[PDB]
Design a protein around this ligand. Structure first.
Ligand SMILES: [Cl-]
Length: 290
């Protein structure tokens, strides 16, 4: 797919309009090998946005940018980092995103072992996002601690939709090997037909991150880890002694090989473990420390 064909594809799906007339008060806050990020203000609402300005001539895996724009433009949820607009601006794609300042969950969970109230607070938020996305037929496919972003006031939001997919009556299952090795569901690794259940497995691995500090098999090569995950009974907590019977049960609903037996996001929202959910404030001191 040439640069010219990709622009043509994007032209069909992006918002109309030219953000060079619509935004102001730009401040460069980031840069990468394929673009920059600027904070800016939307003129009539005053809203602050983070504008990813992607040089499509340098960008690779351009199909992922297309898929995220096409899929996520029409979904919104309080626990999902919102994509307000996307625009084709000459040779670049500008994507206007909700701006958050509390870092990523990994910043904290790499350093500290969350208590069960904190774990419940995080899981309840991610599960509200997933229950909404799954009901829409969206599969995230890259759930892991660093896909979870936080606000300074302790709100928990899901981000990093690069690998997302949309299922439909017509195409009800995916079979692509996508995601991040240590968090991939066994059926993804085996390239079986799969649907929204894979995000629940990944969430289970994230719970292990929260309790233990790292996912299973983390010292193995990513290829070796995938082989063990593909073949083996589900991985267990290293710190199993730490965890309440109710949290053990919650985790055991997630890390289930048989995707039909595995819990759905809605089942997990209804689980007694989430009776332990705290106020956003329960994360705020940690977010400030890390
Ligand atoms: Cl924030």
């Amino acid at each position: 797919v040439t640069h010219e064909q990709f622009k043509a594809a994007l032209r069909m799906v992006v918002d109309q309009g030219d953000p060079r007339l619509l935004l102001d008060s730009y401040v460069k806050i980031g840069e990468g090998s394929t673009g920059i990020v600027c904070l800016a203000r939307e003129k009539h609402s005053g809203r602050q946005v983070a504008v990813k300005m992607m040089d499509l001539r340098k960008q690779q895996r351009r199909e992922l940018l297309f898929n995220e724009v096409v899929i996520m433009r029409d979904y919104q949820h309080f626990n999902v980092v919102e994509m307000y607009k996307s625009y084709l601006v000459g040779e670049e794609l500008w994507v206007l995103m909700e701006f958050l300042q509390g870092g990523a969950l990994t910043d904290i969970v790499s350093q500290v072992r969350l208590n069960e109230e904190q774990i419940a607070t995080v899981c309840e938020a991610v599960l509200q996002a997933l229950a909404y996305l799954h009901a829409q037929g969206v599969i995230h496919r890259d759930i892991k601690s660093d896909s979870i972003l936080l606000t300074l006031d302790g709100r928990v939001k899901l981000s990093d939709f690069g690998f997302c997919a949309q299922i439909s009556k017509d195409v009800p299952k995916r079979k692509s090997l996508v995601g991040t090795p240590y968090w991939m569901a066994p059926e993804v690794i085996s390239r079986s037909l799969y649907a929204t259940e894979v995000d629940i497995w990944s969430l289970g691995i994230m719970v292990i991150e929260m309790v233990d500090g790292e996912p299973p098999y983390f010292s193995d090569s990513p290829v070796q880890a995938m082989k063990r995950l593909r073949d083996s009974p589900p991985p267990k907590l290293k710190n199993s002694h730490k965890v309440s019977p109710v949290l053990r049960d919650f985790l055991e609903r997630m890390l289930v090989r048989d995707p039909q037996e595995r819990a759905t996001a809605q089942e997990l929202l209804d689980h007694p473990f989430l009776l332990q959910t705290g106020l956003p404030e329960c994360l705020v001191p940690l977010i400030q420390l890390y």
